[PDB]
């Protein structure tokens, strides 16, 4: 499960610490606004730990969703 393809593998060279950048960070969330696990994000321990902080920041700023409605169930 969660094996489909590698969120990190397809993406450019980006700053993991940038909360203002949205369009890149969007790819680290599921259909719901939940933060994808390492299985998906493909990141490393430190990378993931930083991503979490960043995403949460952008959430508070209102640039990223806390929660999203699941469609076609």
């Amino acid at each position: 499960p969660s094996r489909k393809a590698k969120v990190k593998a397809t993406l450019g060279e980006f700053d993991l610490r940038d909360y203002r950048n949205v369009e890149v960070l969007k790819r680290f969330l599921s259909e719901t606004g939940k933060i994808l696990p390492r299985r998906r994000t493909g990141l490393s321990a430190k990378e993931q730990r930083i991503l979490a902080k960043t995403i949460k920041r952008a959430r508070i700023l209102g640039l990223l969703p806390f929660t999203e409605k699941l469609v076609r169930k």
Partner: protein, 119 residues
């Protein structure tokens, strides 16, 4: 007497019962149904079949208002959720979309003892 013809269908499903509320696009209720609305009384309200009957009832009462197509919003996880969706699809109402809105907190309130080992 309304003549809405475009609407939303809220399916609220628990293990004890199923309630279907059909409303206008602004969310204001038109008609509603449930396991208890139909003949069922006891635990049989939680039954998938009872859910079907409820959905169908709500759909008929809706088409009485000239309703045609709805957007389904599903809240709750329990038996007869998917059956209610099914009945709605087969009800003659065109189902445009189905969405799961089921409420979850982020460790908000202490659940009662039955629901514990969680928060």
């Amino acid at each position: 007497k309304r003549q809405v013809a475009s609407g939303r269908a809220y399916i609220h499903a628990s293990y004890n019962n199923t309630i279907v509320t059909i409303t206008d696009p602004d969310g204001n209720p038109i008609t509603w149904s449930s396991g208890g609305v139909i003949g069922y009384k006891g635990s049989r309200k939680g039954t998938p079949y009872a859910a079907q009957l409820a959905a169908l009832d709500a759909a008929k009462k809706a088409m009485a208002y000239g309703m045609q197509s709805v957007d389904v919003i599903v809240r709750g996880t329990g038996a007869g959720r998917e059956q209610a969706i099914r009945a709605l699809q087969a009800s003659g109402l065109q189902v445009k979309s189905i969405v799961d809105d089921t409420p979850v907190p982020h460790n908000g309130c202490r659940p009662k003892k039955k629901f514990r080992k969680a928060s």
